[PDB]
């Protein structure tokens, strides 16, 4: 960068980078139980911290997938060689994370389990984990050619204000 870019463009471009990285990781690590990414900078080096429920699947047999993911993140975003490091981290209290519960319900439905048996299965596990309340919704062609929806609810739930 022969002359530096203005602060308005700099702060918008840094947000556009985090959005595309989160989309790539979302669809690579879906069955592997992904739930978020965090990124931090230090002189000559960028560290990316990645949260999942089954961290050994993020690593692979001897760390193969961490080496493959380090290579493609560097290759696509234009970092220089060796300035990027990826660290996998285990999710605390996985019953209180909405993304891990939406993905595990998706794979439970995709395996052919019945809709109400699946939905009360996650509704129990969220409330046993110590939430104050929850709301699960499924919609589409549930049983027949005309569309429907189901609400499952327990405990407290606010809708308005900050």
């Amino acid at each position: 960068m022969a002359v530096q870019i203005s602060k308005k463009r700099k702060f918008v471009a840094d947000g556009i980078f985090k959005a595309e990285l989160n989309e790539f990781l979302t669809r690579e690590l879906a069955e592997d139980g992904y739930s978020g990414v965090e990124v931090r900078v230090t002189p000559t080096r960028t560290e990316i911290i990645i949260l999942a429920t089954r961290t050994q699947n993020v690593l692979g047999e001897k760390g193969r997938r961490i080496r493959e993911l380090t290579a493609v993140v560097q290759k696509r975003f234009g970092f220089p060689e060796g300035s990027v490091e990826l660290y996998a981290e285990k999710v605390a209290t996985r019953g209180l994370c909405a993304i891990a519960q939406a993905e595990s319900l998706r794979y439970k439905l995709l395996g052919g389990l019945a809709v109400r048996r699946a939905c009360y299965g996650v509704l129990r596990f969220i409330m046993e984990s110590g939430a104050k309340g929850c709301e699960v919704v499924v919609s589409g062609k549930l049983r027949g050619q005309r569309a429907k929806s189901m609400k499952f609810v327990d405990g407290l739930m606010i809708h308005s204000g900050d």
Binding site: E20, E23, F24, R27, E28, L59, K62, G63, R64, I66, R67, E68, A71, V72, K75, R76
Partner: protein
């Protein structure tokens, strides 16, 4: 012809050395970036990697106008043969992480 054999070897040698490939979905840009300088277009990279996927020798992913490809064990076996390399080589990734 799909491409000159000079181009086809230069894609496979870069894939075998690095262990991964990345390209954008645009057939019109005249050169692929990085070590595919010295004249091959990214149209040849897309068409080469598609032919390698339908044999089972690479995995594929896609997000926001970019392809991502990863080499796999049957593809390592096929490329080491095609490039005539010694049977002991594995140049891309080997050392166990901590």
């Amino acid at each position: 012809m799909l491409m000159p054999k000079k181009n086809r070897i230069a894609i496979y040698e870069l894939l075998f050395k690095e262990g991964v490939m990345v390209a954008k979905k645009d057939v019109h840009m005249p050169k692929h970036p990085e070590l595919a300088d010295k004249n091959v277009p990214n149209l040849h990279v897309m068409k080469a990697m598609q032919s390698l996927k339908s044999r089972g020798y690479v995995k594929e992913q896609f997000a926001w106008r970019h392809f991502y490809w990863y080499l796999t064990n049957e593809g390592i076996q096929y490329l080491r043969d095609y490039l005539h390399l010694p049977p002991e080589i594995v140049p891309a990734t080997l050392r166990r992480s901590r």
